[PDB]
Structure formats: structure tokens, C-alpha cells
Design a protein around this ligand. Structure first.
Ligand SMILES: [Mg+2]
Ligand SMILES: [Mg+2]
Ligand SMILES: [Mg+2]
Ligand SMILES: [Mg+2]
Ligand SMILES: [Mg+2]
Ligand SMILES: [Mg+2]
Ligand SMILES: [Mg+2]
Ligand SMILES: [Mg+2]
Ligand SMILES: [Mg+2]
Ligand SMILES: [Mg+2]
Ligand SMILES: [Mg+2]
Ligand SMILES: [Mg+2]
Ligand SMILES: [Mg+2]
Ligand SMILES: [Mg+2]
Ligand SMILES: [Mg+2]
Ligand SMILES: [Mg+2]
Ligand SMILES: [Mg+2]
Ligand SMILES: [Mg+2]
Ligand SMILES: [Mg+2]
Ligand SMILES: [Mg+2]
Ligand SMILES: [Mg+2]
Ligand SMILES: [Mg+2]
Ligand SMILES: [Mg+2]
Ligand SMILES: [Mg+2]
Ligand SMILES: [Mg+2]
Ligand SMILES: [Mg+2]
Ligand SMILES: [Mg+2]
Ligand SMILES: [Mg+2]
Ligand SMILES: [Mg+2]
Ligand SMILES: [Mg+2]
Ligand SMILES: [Mg+2]
Ligand SMILES: [Mg+2]
Ligand SMILES: [Mg+2]
Ligand SMILES: [Mg+2]
Ligand SMILES: [Mg+2]
Ligand SMILES: [Mg+2]
Ligand SMILES: [Mg+2]
Ligand SMILES: [Mg+2]
Ligand SMILES: [Mg+2]
Ligand SMILES: [Mg+2]
Ligand SMILES: [Mg+2]
Ligand SMILES: [Mg+2]
Ligand SMILES: [Mg+2]
Ligand SMILES: [Mg+2]
Ligand SMILES: [Mg+2]
Ligand SMILES: [Mg+2]
Ligand SMILES: [Mg+2]
Ligand SMILES: [Mg+2]
Ligand SMILES: [Mg+2]
Ligand SMILES: [Mg+2]
Ligand SMILES: [Mg+2]
Ligand SMILES: [Mg+2]
Ligand SMILES: [Mg+2]
Ligand SMILES: [Mg+2]
Ligand SMILES: [Mg+2]
Ligand SMILES: [Mg+2]
Ligand SMILES: [Mg+2]
Ligand SMILES: [Mg+2]
Ligand SMILES: [Mg+2]
Ligand SMILES: [Mg+2]
Ligand SMILES: [Mg+2]
Ligand SMILES: [Mg+2]
Ligand SMILES: [Mg+2]
Ligand SMILES: [Mg+2]
Ligand SMILES: [Mg+2]
Ligand SMILES: [Mg+2]
Ligand SMILES: [Mg+2]
Ligand SMILES: [Mg+2]
Ligand SMILES: [Mg+2]
Ligand SMILES: [Mg+2]
Ligand SMILES: [Mg+2]
Ligand SMILES: [Mg+2]
Ligand SMILES: [Mg+2]
Ligand SMILES: [Mg+2]
Ligand SMILES: [Mg+2]
Ligand SMILES: [Mg+2]
Ligand SMILES: [Mg+2]
Ligand SMILES: [Mg+2]
Ligand SMILES: [Mg+2]
Ligand SMILES: [Mg+2]
Lengths: 180, 200, 131, 122
RNA sequence: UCGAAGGUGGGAUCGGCGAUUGGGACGAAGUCGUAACAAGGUAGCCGUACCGGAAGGUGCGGCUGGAUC
RNA sequence: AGUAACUGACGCUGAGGAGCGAAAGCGUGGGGAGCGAACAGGAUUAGAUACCCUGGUAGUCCACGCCGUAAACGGUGGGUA
RNA sequence: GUGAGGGAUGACGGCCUUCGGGUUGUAAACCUCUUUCAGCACAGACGAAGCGCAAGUGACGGUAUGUGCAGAAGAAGGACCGGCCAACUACGUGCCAGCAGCCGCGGUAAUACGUAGGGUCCGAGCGUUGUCCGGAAUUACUGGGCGUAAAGAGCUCGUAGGUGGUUUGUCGCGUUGUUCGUGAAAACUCACAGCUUAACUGUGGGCGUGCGGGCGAUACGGGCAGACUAGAGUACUGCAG
RNA sequence: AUCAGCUUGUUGGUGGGGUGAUGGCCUACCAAGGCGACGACGGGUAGCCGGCCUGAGAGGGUGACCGGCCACACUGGGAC
């Protein structure tokens, strides 16, 4: 089960000595809803071929989201492409607050609570690149502590330890219910 | 002011049943009008408004009313979606419907407005009454003698009584205990879309 | 001219991290020394030791690298600088990297880390954000 | 810009280009129309629109566009004018409301009736 | 003694109008023209002085955001 | 650049202010081969008040003052690590 | 508040049709129900441990509020439907008559004009208009740039100001170190409670983000009270232009 | 600053009067300066504040009602 979405459809054109040659380009985002993200950019002369190319490229290119239970770990300032997209977690149930392309990519990621803002070049392609880079910039507390050579309690806050323990207990309960 | 027009219009146009017993919806799922079969471009705003209008035309609430529930639910420290679901389910109409004493939300609302119900021995005729924790709902003899109430109370074989609601006897006494969680509430639709649409 | 030793130190360290270097030699000072001390205590750096040069004391800092070569330091930036000096009260201690980073705050005891500073309830000027 | 520059000078906020300055920020004025005639649009649009010159209480001479397909305005007539921009006409920034003072709603209107001032059919 | 109002006389600011004139923008379409964009048929541009209905031309100095060899 | 004898916080940038500054232009008084705005002719064009040709007045030179602008470009202020 | 439960492979009539039919539609006529609030009557407050040594004192109001009577009986409209932006077809004139917040729409067959239906949004309110913030990171302290898009002044010397190369010493005037001490009332936020719930207000907290003095600290961030030199300058010898 | 100097009881001292209270609040006599590029004097606008709207915040806009002050009562003055 994968989540599919389309963000923008553009009628690109090419010129020859005879006249105008039209073409179609599409960008799609694929995700499993658990924290696995794939982006695809596909070009054709017709929408079905375009979306097929986009889906294939997205299937080729994947990326994993290290989310804590339901939300993001820490605020991230994703500076890439030409747009500035700033992501940070929030209180559970607040919702994934983001623009169009960011909305699509985060919903395909499966996150449920995020605060986002795009600060320039509202173009969908650049926004998607900036969000992907923002997720790449994300760091996870366990291997952050491993890199720093200091144990978890001496690195990460007790509140996020409590949240992680609650998330682990909920995941264990869900696994038990699914097995039974 | 309440929508006096046909109720099947909402389900037919919108694409999911609301009352649940609509034969017209299952006969023709497409929206009415000369051109309900025309292809429609996908839109996040279409679907966000779609969830909103499903919710509001399903529970029968007012627009200002529902926005006030939204801001209320936001300002309680608890999770916004669960708070909104409680503050909407706490409407006495929905409570008395899901308790099995009414055949539909509209009929619960009409009977409450006419005032066939007693709350803790106090006269109440307000469809939008608020029910807090550990409250008592009573039904008066003038309404036990009412014929449609008898039909409802000896035909109550509808969806099962929830955890927080329960009836104790033939007098149709409705009691509330605690705050339900979303998982056992298992209400259709998704509050995330509504909260995000009002987050716009 | 040479006008900010702490910013110069932070920039040389993060430039060395970007250039994948291992050893950096800087002029020695008390501020540099105890900042290296708190860096060693938190564990973002490997180790430091002082030396003697042609004129005065100098301090060398060895960067930290793991088996898979990814940087042990993500980025540095200074918030309090000559001119714009920013300070924090006892309740408005800055949150860095969602609490996963470290802010260096000079309190009545000295240059101490933000978490234990909030534990003590003490506060002051934030030197830099290290994450 | 550096810290001492900001301290020394300070930053001046933008000034808003006010639109329909003849209203002086006041939504509606009453006016008397002096002349009624027609004007031609720009290159993209070719038509023959109707505009009126109205003396405002603010003693400001401004053009006023007449919506609808029919009107009975003549010289020395009582007119109520609101603010509204038109693209094709170069120097017209106001629209004449319908159904007030000497102007009556244009007949045969049944759709979008409140905007043009039509009473309800029985 | 002070003292408001009033009147003498000349300076500043805000203005309103004013023959006529100078300049600008929007119309659309017409005459006069070939200016610039390709070595645009005299390489372009900048500062400056002169000249000519007009775009411009020339002198001096500076740049290549100039193509060949 | 080397020796590093000595001073021992004198360093940096710098609003307003002040000094220098391509060519052309102006005053006074000299100089003035070549070059060359302006202006005459000759030539082309339907048309040339331009491009081309023959001439040549300011200027181009000198001294004292002035104006203080250039695509004054590395179209990038300086200093430090 | 202007209703309903059930009611047909879905009765008129309108609009399209490919002339098969589809639309308005569970809508409607229908069989039953309670009839809120207005309508007609009865009772009828508290607001007053109040004032008087008097015999009474309520404008509101004979209202609010209860108790009975009759009847679904008295009750819905406004914008939008080219893309932005949830909502389309037909009919009538074609660079005319006209729309419009940005792009922009009619030069005989318009989902953008006008009329019809149909659907969407909202609702006792519906839109237009004007002012203010947000998106506008579009005045960028957090949080912008200066090669070509807007920008490095022509370049130096340098006054006032802003900022300083090590470690050798007090007072604590930049400062945090804790406590008592103000923060009127009202408002905001948290919980409680009352008017049948509704606005409304009834009580007690809490909130009240700044500033006053007495007591306890010295790591950075300044003056002040003494020494050294990694910046800088000088000194000795040469150097090319 | 497309407003660079302002001021002559003006500035300061002493002695008198003055007022509930000190004081160029008023007078006389002595000296020449004070305020000024860390924006004076000039020009336009406007009651201030607890608050309201918007914005996550910073900030921006604003002064409805209520409430804390301020100033006025057709215009200008004066006093019991
Ligand atoms: Mg950046
Ligand atoms: Mg942008
Ligand atoms: Mg944008
Ligand atoms: Mg919002
Ligand atoms: Mg810079
Ligand atoms: Mg402007
Ligand atoms: Mg309309
Ligand atoms: Mg229309
Ligand atoms: Mg004038
Ligand atoms: Mg005039
Ligand atoms: Mg021509
Ligand atoms: Mg040419
Ligand atoms: Mg030519
Ligand atoms: Mg040329
Ligand atoms: Mg040229
Ligand atoms: Mg020139
Ligand atoms: Mg010439
Ligand atoms: Mg030259
Ligand atoms: Mg070029
Ligand atoms: Mg020595
Ligand atoms: Mg120097
Ligand atoms: Mg300097
Ligand atoms: Mg200086
Ligand atoms: Mg200056
Ligand atoms: Mg300067
Ligand atoms: Mg000079
Ligand atoms: Mg000079
Ligand atoms: Mg020369
Ligand atoms: Mg010269
Ligand atoms: Mg001359
Ligand atoms: Mg001369
Ligand atoms: Mg001479
Ligand atoms: Mg010559
Ligand atoms: Mg010549
Ligand atoms: Mg001659
Ligand atoms: Mg000639
Ligand atoms: Mg210049
Ligand atoms: Mg040069
Ligand atoms: Mg320079
Ligand atoms: Mg530099
Ligand atoms: Mg029925
Ligand atoms: Mg009643
Ligand atoms: Mg009484
Ligand atoms: Mg009594
Ligand atoms: Mg009552
Ligand atoms: Mg539409
Ligand atoms: Mg739509
Ligand atoms: Mg047509
Ligand atoms: Mg409709
Ligand atoms: Mg706004
Ligand atoms: Mg900064
Ligand atoms: Mg900016
Ligand atoms: Mg530029
Ligand atoms: Mg420049
Ligand atoms: Mg310049
Ligand atoms: Mg100094
Ligand atoms: Mg102290
Ligand atoms: Mg204290
Ligand atoms: Mg206090
Ligand atoms: Mg109080
Ligand atoms: Mg709030
Ligand atoms: Mg109560
Ligand atoms: Mg309170
Ligand atoms: Mg605040
Ligand atoms: Mg200092
Ligand atoms: Mg010594
Ligand atoms: Mg030296
Ligand atoms: Mg030499
Ligand atoms: Mg005296
Ligand atoms: Mg005395
Ligand atoms: Mg005095
Ligand atoms: Mg005296
Ligand atoms: Mg305030
Ligand atoms: Mg904000
Ligand atoms: Mg802001
Ligand atoms: Mg204010
Ligand atoms: Mg008051
Ligand atoms: Mg006071
Ligand atoms: Mg008066
Ligand atoms: Mg007065």
C-alpha cells in the first residue's frame, strides 16, 4: 500500500522550423505512510506516460524519515534549491501545517503534526527539493548520542524520553493486537 | 434556523451517506444535476472543504456554532481533534440519538427543541445543550406517553450503545461517565482535514 | 583586524570540520581554554592540550571522526557578538536543536551548559549554539 | 546594514499608495452628475461603455462608470457613488451603485438581482 | 505697571487662481525617417563639448556587456 | 626580506568635514608642427544638415586658477584569522 | 422557530435528449405524530434580614416564569457556478449589447455577456464598498542583498563616535547569583460555580509579562588601581621599481 | 535638515518681594554665556494609558465601550 499524489501539471513546449511541439511534465510523490519518502519528476507528451514516468522515478528514488512516534524530532532549517522551508514538530493532533507541495510530500511521508513555512520561490519543484533536504538534515537522538560518545540520558531530554517510551509502548500494543 | 430542504441532497451530491439508510444513495452514488458525471480536478481544498461539509451537514450544526467548537477545542490543552469530537458529541441531540432514543439527529433535535426531556429534574428545551461528566438524563411522563417515543424505545435495535453512554431501564435514563478515546469512538471521517481547513 | 577571538575559534574549528582536518593550532586564551573544556565535557570534540610556541602559549584541538567518516559537528553559529550582545534571563533559556544541541551560557559559576544551568535556575549571556 | 547604522538612522516603513483618494477613506459619497457620454476601451477590448462626470461633496471632479444595460441619468441628477475600479477605461476608479436616489434598478433582472437593485417578482 | 480686542508696516509658510509657455503619460493610424538588436551593413556603450526637424553625427579619453584573424 | 634592540593596548573602520582626481569646458597671459568639433565645398542616395574626399576655426601644448563628473569595472569597501 | 416517521425501480410540469430516455425527487400528494415561539386565558414572582414606629412601601410589570385551550396551522432568502476557487448545460445577440479581484472573455455555432433550468456556498442574514494586520523574508534584530536584475561613493588622510593582540592586581558602576518588598480596578489565560442551556452576569482564586528598597555571588560582558608582547610602529643591513 | 544654529530674565550668583511650600515665581545689582550633530531651535500630525485586531513570536496597525488621568465649555482675557 503506497500513497500517490500529483502536485503540478505543466504544458512545456519545444520549437522547430515547422512550428510548436508540445510536451507534458509531471512531478509526483510516493510514500508508504510510515516514514519512507520517494519523489519523482517525469516528462512525456501525454499525462498517462508522464505520470508513469514520475511513478517509476519515485519508486527508484526513496528516502527514510526518522520520526519519533508521530512527529519530527527537532526543528530543521532546510536551506536548499532556491526556497527556504522551515520544519519543526508540534503538539499531537495539531496537524501537518504546510503549503501545497510540502503538504503532499509530508502526507505521503505519513507524519501527522508539523509546522512549516516557505519563505521564497513558491515553485513546487524547488519547495519539494527543500523539504527533501530538510528531512535529510534531520538527526536522530540515539546515533547522535553514539557520535557524541555520551549516553542517552545525558544527551536527550527526559520529556522526549517519556514520549519515546510511550510511543514504544503503543507500538508494542499495536503489534500485539495485530498478532492476536 | 435549520435546513428544511431534502436531506438526501447532501449524501447524493457529496458522495458518502449520512443517515445510513439512504436507498437513493446506493441506487445512484453520483452527485445529482445534469452533469454529475463530469470529471473533476483533484484539489486539497476541495477535499478539505468536503470533510468540513460532510461533518456539518451530518451533525446538523450551525456554521458559527461549529467554528466556536473549533476554537474551543483548540483552546483546551488536550488534543484538538479529540477535544472537537467530544465538544461536538456532547450536543444533547447526538447524545440522545446515539443512546437509541431517537431515530435520527434531526428528530432528536426536534424533540429536544420541543422539550420532551428533563435534565437532573430541570426543564430543558435547547437542542445544543452541553452534557458534562457524570450527568443524569431523564424523560418525563408526558413524553413516555408520547407515541413516537414509545416506538423508538421499544424499537431501539440500532447501532450498539457506546462505552460512555448506557441506559439503565425502561425509563430511558442516559448516563455519561468519562471522556471516550478516538479509537473506541470509531466515528467515520477524519478530524485532521477539518482542523487543517480551519488552520487555513 | 583581529577583533573577536571566540568567533575566530568557532569559525576555524568548523572550517577544519568542513575541510576534514585533524589538528588546529590557535593562540591560547582563558576563554578558548575553558570553551574547549566544556566542549570536551560534552563530547563534541576528541581532546585538547596546551603547548608552548615561539612567543606565548598555544592550544591545539583534535577533531573527532568515526568509522563512517560523517562529521561529528553539524554547524556552529554565534549569537552574542560585539555590538549585538544577547542575554537570557532565568526563565528564557534558549532551546537549541529542539533540546538536542548545547548553548554555552556564562553564569555566576562560569561557562556552563544550558541544561544544568536551568537546573540551577541560573542564567546569563549565550556564547554560541553548537549542534 | 550594521548595528551602529540601525541605531543611528532607524528604518522607515513603506508608505501606502492610497487608492480612490477622492473618497478620503470614506466609502460612499453623494454627487450630482454634470455630463453623460461614452468612452472607448484600450487595445484588448473594443466596446462603447457609458461613464458620467459627477460633482462630489468633497468638491472633487471624478468619472463614474454606470453598470447595467439601461439607465435614465441626465444632466443635473442626484447620484450615489461608491468606489470601484475598471481596467479598460484608463482614468475611471468609481462605479455608480444602482437603486438609490434618482437611479432605479434596470428592468428584467432576475439573476444577481441584489447587486443591481431589482425588487422581487410575485 | 501689566493687560485682551482693534490699527499701523514690512519679513516667512500654506496655499487657490492666472493669459501663455515648458515637459510627461496614455491613445491609434498616418507622414518623415534607419537609430539599436547578427562585424544591423560606420562595433557598442560611458563622461564631456559642438552641430543638425528627428532618431543621431563628430572630437578627446575610458570598458568589453565585441565578431573574425 | 633577515637581526628581532626598544615602545608596551598605541589596532581597526570611520556619519557629518576636509584633500587628491580621466577627458572635455571656462578666465587671464603665451605657445601652436601634426591631429581635429564647428563651417565651406566635391561625392552617393528619391532624400544626407552623416558615413567618404579636399580644407581648417576652438581645442589638443605651457603657467596660475577654476567645474568635479566617467561602463571612475574586478560593474565585488577596507582590515584580520 | 418556518416540522416531521413511512411512502414508487419513483404521479404532474419544467429542462435536455443520441428520441432508448434522464432530470427536478422522499422532493410532492398522501396515513399518523408532537405542536416549541408567536395567538387566547389563569396563577404569578425574587429583585426589599432594606426604611418607617409605622400599618405600609416595585417604575420595571400585572412583564419575566409556570399552569391550560385550538390548530402543521403564522413564518426564507442572498451570492457563486473559465483557472485561481467546493458548483454546467440549453436558449438570445456577435469586436455590438456587456463582465471583471489577476490572468483575461464575444470578429455567427460563449461552461467568462443576458435568460432559463440545474448544482454549489451561506442563512435571518446574504454581497458590495472603505480603513487595519497577515501571507510580504515586500524594510529581513531573530530574518535580505550589492559581478551582471537595485546598490560599493573616484580614491585617500583623518576629527567626534563604534570596536581591540597575552598574562601578570582592587572596588563591582555592562551583569546574572536568591529572598522579602510593588505590579489600582478591569481584560487576557487555567479551574470552579449560577442564570433551564444562550448572550448576561453571581462567588473565590489565579493572571496581573514593568518598576522601587534591605540581604546574600564574581565566569564573561566595562572604567578604575600595577607588568609583559603574538597586532602595530621604530631601530641595523640590503632590495627592485 | 528640501528645518543648523537657538536664546537676552537668557543663563548663573547675591540681596529684596512673592507664594501653603523651594524656585528668575517677580525686582535690583554683578559675570557671559547655557542649550546645540549621542539631532537644539523650526515645520505637519495627534489627547495619553490598562486595552482591541492581526501575527507562533518579534512586530505592525489602533484608542470603539468601560475604566486611570489630561485639557475645554460660543471666541479671548481677568479676578472675588
Ligand atoms: Mg542562506
Ligand atoms: Mg519569496
Ligand atoms: Mg508565492
Ligand atoms: Mg490561520
Ligand atoms: Mg559584508
Ligand atoms: Mg515607490
Ligand atoms: Mg454574478
Ligand atoms: Mg453569470
Ligand atoms: Mg504654488
Ligand atoms: Mg491657473
Ligand atoms: Mg513609417
Ligand atoms: Mg542600423
Ligand atoms: Mg547605414
Ligand atoms: Mg552601431
Ligand atoms: Mg552605434
Ligand atoms: Mg555623451
Ligand atoms: Mg561632427
Ligand atoms: Mg575613448
Ligand atoms: Mg554582451
Ligand atoms: Mg627586552
Ligand atoms: Mg593602518
Ligand atoms: Mg577611522
Ligand atoms: Mg577613525
Ligand atoms: Mg559623517
Ligand atoms: Mg562620509
Ligand atoms: Mg582643497
Ligand atoms: Mg582646494
Ligand atoms: Mg586631452
Ligand atoms: Mg585637461
Ligand atoms: Mg566654451
Ligand atoms: Mg584658461
Ligand atoms: Mg589665451
Ligand atoms: Mg585637419
Ligand atoms: Mg573629421
Ligand atoms: Mg571661403
Ligand atoms: Mg558638409
Ligand atoms: Mg557616479
Ligand atoms: Mg581606472
Ligand atoms: Mg572602493
Ligand atoms: Mg574584510
Ligand atoms: Mg412525513
Ligand atoms: Mg410559553
Ligand atoms: Mg418580595
Ligand atoms: Mg421576606
Ligand atoms: Mg421559561
Ligand atoms: Mg466553477
Ligand atoms: Mg470549484
Ligand atoms: Mg450561444
Ligand atoms: Mg441553485
Ligand atoms: Mg491585510
Ligand atoms: Mg545577527
Ligand atoms: Mg531582506
Ligand atoms: Mg545592477
Ligand atoms: Mg558603485
Ligand atoms: Mg557616484
Ligand atoms: Mg578616543
Ligand atoms: Mg548589585
Ligand atoms: Mg531583591
Ligand atoms: Mg518584585
Ligand atoms: Mg483584584
Ligand atoms: Mg488569545
Ligand atoms: Mg449552574
Ligand atoms: Mg477572572
Ligand atoms: Mg505582549
Ligand atoms: Mg571600552
Ligand atoms: Mg620585563
Ligand atoms: Mg613589534
Ligand atoms: Mg630600487
Ligand atoms: Mg532671591
Ligand atoms: Mg532660602
Ligand atoms: Mg523662579
Ligand atoms: Mg533680584
Ligand atoms: Mg501595552
Ligand atoms: Mg508573528
Ligand atoms: Mg510581524
Ligand atoms: Mg495608543
Ligand atoms: Mg471611569
Ligand atoms: Mg496622578
Ligand atoms: Mg474657554
Ligand atoms: Mg479657555
Amino acid at each position: 500500500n503506497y500513497i500517490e499524489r500529483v502536485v503540478s501539471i505543466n504544458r512545456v513546449s519545444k520549437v522547430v522550423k515547422g512550428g510548436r511541439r508540445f510536451s507534458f511534465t509531471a512531478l509526483v510523490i510516493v510514500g508508504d505512510g510510515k516514514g519512507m519518502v520517494g519523489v519523482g519528476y517525469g516528462k512525456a507528451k501525454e499525462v498517462p506516460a508522464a505520470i508513469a514516468k514520475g511513478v517509476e522515478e519515485a519508486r527508484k528514488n526513496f528516502f527514510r524519515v526518522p520520526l519519533i512516534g508521530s512527529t519530527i524530532t527537532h526543528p530543521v532549517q532546510g536551506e536548499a534549491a532556491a526556497g527556504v522551508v522551515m520544519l519543526r514538530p508540534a503538539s499531537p493532533g495539531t496537524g501537518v501545517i504546510a503549503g501545497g507541495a510540502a503538504r503532499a510530500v509530508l502526507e505521503c511521508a505519513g507524519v501527522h503534526d508539523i509546522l512549516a513555512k516557505s519563505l521564497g520561490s513558491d515553485n513546487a519543484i524547488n519547495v519539494v527539493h527543500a523539504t527533501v533536504a530538510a528531512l535529510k538534515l534531520l538527526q536522530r537522538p540515539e546515533e547522535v548520542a553514539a557520535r557524541r560518545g555520551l549516553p542517552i540520558e545525558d544527551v536527550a531530554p527526559a520529556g522526549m524520553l517519556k514520549a519515546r517510551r510511550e510511543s514504544e509502548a503503543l507500538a508494542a500494543a499495536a503489534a500485539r493486537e495485530g498478532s492476536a | 434556523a435549520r435546513y428544511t430542504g431534502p436531506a438526501t441532497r447532501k449524501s447524493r451530491r457529496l458522495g458518502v451517506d449520512l443517515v445510513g439508510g439512504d436507498q437513493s444513495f446506493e441506487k445512484r452514488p453520483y452527485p445529482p444535476g445534469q452533469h454529475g458525471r463530469a470529471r473533476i480536478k483533484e484539489s486539497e481544498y476541495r477535499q478539505q472543504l468536503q470533510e468540513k461539509q460532510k461533518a456539518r451537514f451530518s451533525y446538523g450544526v450551525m456554521e458559527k456554532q461549529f467554528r466556536r467548537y473549533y476554537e474551543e477545542a483548540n483552546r483546551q490543552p488536550g488534543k484538538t481533534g479529540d477535544n472537537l469530537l467530544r465538544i461536538l458529541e456532547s450536543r444533547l441531540d447526538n447524545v440522545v440519538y446515539r443512546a437509541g432514543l431517537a431515530r435520527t439527529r434531526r428528530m432528536a433535535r426536534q424533540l429536544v427543541s420541543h422539550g420532551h426531556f428533563l435534565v437532573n429534574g430541570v426543564k430543558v428545551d435547547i437542542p445544543s445543550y452541553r452534557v458534562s461528566q457524570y450527568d443524569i438524563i431523564d424523560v418525563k411522563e408526558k413524553s413516555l406517553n408520547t407515541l413516537p417515543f414509545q416506538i423508538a424505545r421499544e424499537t431501539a435495535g440500532e447501532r450498539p450503545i457506546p462505552s460512555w453512554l448506557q441506559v439503565v431501564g425502561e425509563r430511558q435514563r442516559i448516563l455519561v461517565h468519562q471522556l471516550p478515546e478516538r479509537a473506541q469512538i470509531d466515528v467515520p471521517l477524519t478530524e485532521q482535514l477539518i482542523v487543517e481547513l480551519y488552520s487555513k | 583586524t583581529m577583533t573577536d577571538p571566540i568567533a575566530d575559534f568557532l569559525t576555524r574549528l568548523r572550517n577544519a570540520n568542513s575541510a576534514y582536518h585533524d589538528e588546529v593550532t590557535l593562540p591560547h586564551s582563558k576563554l578558548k581554554a575553558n570553551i574547549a573544556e566544556i566542549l570536551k565535557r560534552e563530547g563534541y570534540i576528541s581532546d585538547y592540550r596546551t603547548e608552548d610556541a615561539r612567543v606565548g602559549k598555544s592550544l591545539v584541538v583534535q577533531l573527532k571522526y568515526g568509522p563512517s567518516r560523517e562529521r561529528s559537528i553539524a554547524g556552529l553559529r554565534r549569537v552574542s557578538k560585539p555590538g549585538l550582545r544577547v542575554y537570557a534571563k532565568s526563565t528564557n533559556l534558549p532551546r537549541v536543536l529542539g533540546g538536542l544541541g548545547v548553548a554555552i551560557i556564562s553564569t555566576s559559576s562560569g561557562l556552563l551548559t544550558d541544561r544544568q544551568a536551568a537546573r540551577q535556575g541560573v542564567g546569563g549571556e549565550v556564547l554560541a549554539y553548537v549542534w | 546594514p550594521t548595528i551602529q547604522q540601525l541605531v543611528r538612522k532607524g528604518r522607515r516603513d513603506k508608505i501606502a499608495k492610497v487608492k480612490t483618494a477622492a473618497l478620503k477613506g470614506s466609502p460612499q459619497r453623494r454627487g450630482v452628475c454634470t455630463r453623460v457620454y461614452t468612452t472607448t476601451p484600450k487595445k484588448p477590448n473594443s466596446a462603447l461603455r457609458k461613464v458620467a462626470r459627477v460633482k462630489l461633496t468633497s468638491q472633487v471632479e471624478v468619472t463614474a462608470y454606470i453598470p447595467g444595460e439601461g439607465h435614465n441619468l441626465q444632466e443635473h441628477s442626484m447620484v450615489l457613488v461608491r468606489g470601484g475600479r475598471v481596467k479598460d477605461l484608463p482614468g475611471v476608479r468609481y462605479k455608480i451603485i444602482r437603486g438609490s436616489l434618482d437611479t432605479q434598478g434596470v428592468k428584467n433582472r432576475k439573476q444577481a438581482r441584489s447587486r443591481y437593485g431589482a425588487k422581487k417578482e410575485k
